[PDB]
Amino acid sequence: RKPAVERKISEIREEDTRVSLIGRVIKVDKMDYMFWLDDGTGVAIIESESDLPKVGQVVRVIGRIIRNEEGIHIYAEVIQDFSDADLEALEEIRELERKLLPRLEGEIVW
């Protein structure tokens, strides 16, 4: 199947289908089982099926985007908590991955 993809709120692309996001819940709504995330750079609308996060903690979500005419919605399927964790090291290792990895496989032959 399609490997999981991790992206960022302001740089989310149309070509992406299943995406991973990290952010903080600012507010929720129970009638629609939906809620809002901020990662410090933008607002993300996440439509949960039955589970509900709390406001003010850092979390990660695995979902799929719903590109329709009703607005912006993410068909989330997985949420996981990281209140105990860090994120600067995660960002730095992501940057290292981007600046290294695509060069590596091009090196050597057979």
Binding site: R1, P3, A4, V5, E6, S20
Partner: peptide, 12 residues
């Protein structure tokens, strides 16, 4: 037999 799927963002 018991099997499941492991993913890290690189493959399943």
């Amino acid at each position: 037999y018991g099997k499941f799927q492991v993913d890290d963002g690189t493959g399943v």
